[PDB]
């Protein structure tokens, strides 16, 4: 049942954390640092 | 120089010394559960011969598997179809009983990776094996460059993919005319390449 699989697969919902990993991957998963202040 | 004698000693399995050691142990091993940890390899020379070392992180698990073939699990032995598939009793599983021992030893211990396995006893209904597992997150394993290869994420559950010594044998791998069926990695990789219609652009 391919139609039933694409109704509750990854992406059909909200992705509260996968949408962030996709953003963190573009920067190499940087943590512990901050942008340079003004 | 003791490991060489044990190698030749364990080859005389029909001798009065080994028959007694294989009779009392198979009794002792069948009075335990089908899966239990051993404090040390029953065959120290055989374990190291497969990659075992007396370090912190190496564990031994004895597995008891039911001998015999594979009965077709169909209701009332009725395989609805052509008479080719009417076989229920005389069916043999594709993998060996030693491969099933590592699959059960590795599934119960998800935090460990199966390294190797060896035969320790037989019976009319039981085959006893000892599976060598490793704790790939122990510092005695991650700091030794000779064993860091198993700590990689590509070796997750090798026994489930037939990468161990006993599970790789049932795949038909090898060089020569005997193994033309697995040319190109696996059997399904070879079959997929042998049945792919290559349509070039300027064909």
């Amino acid at each position: 049942s391919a139609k039933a699989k694409r109704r509750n697969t990854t992406g059909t919902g909200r992705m509260r954390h996968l949408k962030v990993v996709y953003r963190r991957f573009k920067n190499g998963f940087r943590e512990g640092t901050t942008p340079k202040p003004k | 120089g003791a490991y060489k004698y044990m190698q030749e000693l364990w080859r005389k399995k029909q001798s009065d010394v080994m028959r007694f050691l294989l009779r009392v142990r198979c009794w002792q091993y069948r009075q335990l559960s089908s899966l239990h940890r051993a404090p040390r390899p029953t065959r120290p020379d055989k374990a190291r011969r497969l990659g075992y070392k007396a370090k912190q992180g190496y564990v031994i698990y004895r597995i008891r598997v039911r001998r015999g073939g594979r009965k077709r699990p169909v209701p009332k032995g009725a395989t609805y179809g052509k008479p080719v598939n009417h076989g229920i009793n005389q069916l043999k599983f594709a993998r060996s009983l030693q491969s099933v021992a590592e699959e059960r030893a590795g599934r119960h211990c998800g935090g460990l990776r199966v390294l190797a396995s060896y035969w320790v006893g037989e019976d009319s209904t039981y085959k006893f094996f000892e599976v060598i597992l490793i704790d790939t997150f122990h510092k005695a394993i991650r700091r030794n460059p000779d064993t860091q290869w198993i700590t990689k994420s590509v070796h997750k559950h090798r026994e489930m993919r037939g990468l161990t010594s006993a599970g790789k044998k049932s795949r038909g791998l090898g060089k020569g005319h005997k193994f033309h069926i697995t040319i190109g990695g696996s059997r399904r990789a070879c079959w997929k390449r042998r049945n792919t219609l290559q349509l070039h652009r300027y064909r």
């Binding site: - | 349509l199 652009r201 300027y202 064909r203």
Partner: protein
């Protein structure tokens, strides 16, 4: 909302191969045709004062 008759397959033979001798033949003819004033004007180019 159904399926079209004979859905277009991606493995259609898009590309045609021509012989190297014919590919060079066509160039020798297109160059020889670029040397005649009648064919260049009949093509439409404005060469009436070149």
């Amino acid at each position: 909302g159904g399926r079209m008759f004979a859905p277009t397959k991606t493995w259609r033979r898009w590309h045609r191969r021509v012989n190297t001798t014919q590919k060079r033949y066509a160039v020798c003819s297109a160059l020889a045709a670029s040397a005649l004033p009648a064919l260049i004007m009949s093509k439409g180019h404005r060469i009436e004062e070149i």
